[PDB]
Design an enzyme around this catalytic site. Structure first.
Site, short mmCIF file in Angstrom:
data_model
loop_
_atom_site.label_atom_id
_atom_site.label_comp_id
_atom_site.label_asym_id
_atom_site.label_seq_id
_atom_site.Cartn_x
_atom_site.Cartn_y
_atom_site.Cartn_z
N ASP A 1 -40.34 -18.87 18.83
CA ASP A 1 -39.09 -18.35 18.25
C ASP A 1 -38.92 -16.88 18.59
OD1 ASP A 1 -36.88 -17.78 16.77
OD2 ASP A 1 -37.88 -17.89 14.81
N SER B 1 -23.57 -9.37 26.41
CA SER B 1 -22.95 -10.16 27.46
C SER B 1 -21.66 -9.49 27.87
CB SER B 1 -22.70 -11.58 26.96
OG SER B 1 -21.91 -12.32 27.87
#
EC number: 3.4.23.22
Length: 330
Positions: free
Chosen positions: A35, A199
């Site tokens: 994770d 992004s």
């Protein structure tokens, strides 16, 4: 040194991925959920409340000659999906894919919430976010990667998750045969303890690319892709019959639909998520309403590039003095 381990979807939907991890001496192999959105290595154990164990493999520290109780240390964590666990702490030898760390904090669960109990395939979590998020008190502990870093050939690990198929976590090297083209690297902020990056925009299907900054986290422990409501609405508007259902808890779509792809930007590069990756199947057994793999982050407080996004790429978690993230197509 290096390590290389195969990671395997837990079910037919890729709801999560498990990777075998050797703990203790002799080795006890547990299948952990790696994770990158948390920083605790915790396991089902011989100390876990008996009614809260249902099929998991447990770590029994009393059977490990290298286990040592970390005196006075406790831990307690709550995850974004509302699940939680807590307990005490041992140090022991932990190996992943041939890479060994001695003195790793192994957090032994005394209590786990129902969603953990109900998932027989996950024996615990191995956190790979920054050690500043580790929950051990009163002395915070380091992640497996943080402990291994100095010994690695290169201070990196890579995630290569498969779509409906096994993939690979590598430590200490970049497998140049595992991706196509080049790896595009992008800046990381560690201010919130996550692999947080920006992004450069998105496209829906064959549509034009929208240049827009989307700050979010690369999180292997989250199943879906969570993005701003504007972006998500634009995606689902291209699927006939799709709608956001408050009763279901997100966007659903007719199971008869063919889903469009979703592209996200990494610098000037582009990662394409095929439409099939966005199908999470019937909302309930036998239903013709299917659950979407792209959902709104509104009310989460952060955008999350979870498995839906990451499995479309070869992803480099670069733990150099100034960390960065790399993405390649594959």
């Amino acid at each position: 040194s290096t390590g290389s381990a195969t990671t395997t979807p837990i079910d037919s939907l890729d709801d999560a991925y498990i990777t075998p991890v050797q703990i203790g001496t002799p080795a006890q192999t547990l299948n952990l959920d790696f994770d990158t959105g948390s920083s605790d290595l915790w396991v089902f154990s011989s100390e876990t409340t008996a009614s809260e164990v249902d099929g998991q493999t447990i770590y029994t520290p009393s059977k490990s000659t290298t286990a040592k109780l970390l005196s006075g240390a406790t831990w307690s964590i709550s995850y974004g999906d509302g699940s939680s666990s807590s307990g005490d702490v041992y140090t022991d030898t932990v190996s992943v894919g041939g890479l060994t760390v001695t003195g790793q904090a192994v957090e032994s669960a005394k209590k786990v919430s129902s969603s953990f109990t109900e998932d027989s395939t996950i024996d615990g979590l191995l956190g790979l976010a920054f050690s500043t998020l580790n929950t051990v008190s009163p002395t915070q502990q380091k992640t497996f990667f943080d402990n291994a870093k100095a010994s690695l050939d290169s201070p990196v690990f890579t995630a290569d998750l498969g779509y409906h198929a096994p993939g690979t976590y590598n430590f200490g090297f970049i497998d140049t045969t595992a991706y196509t083209g080049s790896i595009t690297y992008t800046a990381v902020s560690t201010k919130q303890g996550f692999w947080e990056w920006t992004s450069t925009g998105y496209a829906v299907g064959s549509g034009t690319f929208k240049s827009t900054s989307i700050d979010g986290i690369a999180d292997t422990g989250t199943t879906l892709l969570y993005l701003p409501a504007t972006v998500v609405s634009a995606y689902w508007a291209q699927v006939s019959g799709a709608k956001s259902s408050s009763s279901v808890g997100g966007y659903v779509f007719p199971c008869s639909a063919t889903l469009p792809s979703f592209t996200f930007g990494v610098g000037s590069a582009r990662i394409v998520i095929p439409g099939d990756y966005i199908d999470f199947g019937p909302i309930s057994t036998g239903s013709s309403s299917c659950f979407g793999g792209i959902q709104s982050s509104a009310g989460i407080g952060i955008n999350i590039f979870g498995d839906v996004a990451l499995k479309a790429a070869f992803v480099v978690f670069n733990g150099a003095t100034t960390p960065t993230l790399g993405f390649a197509s594959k």
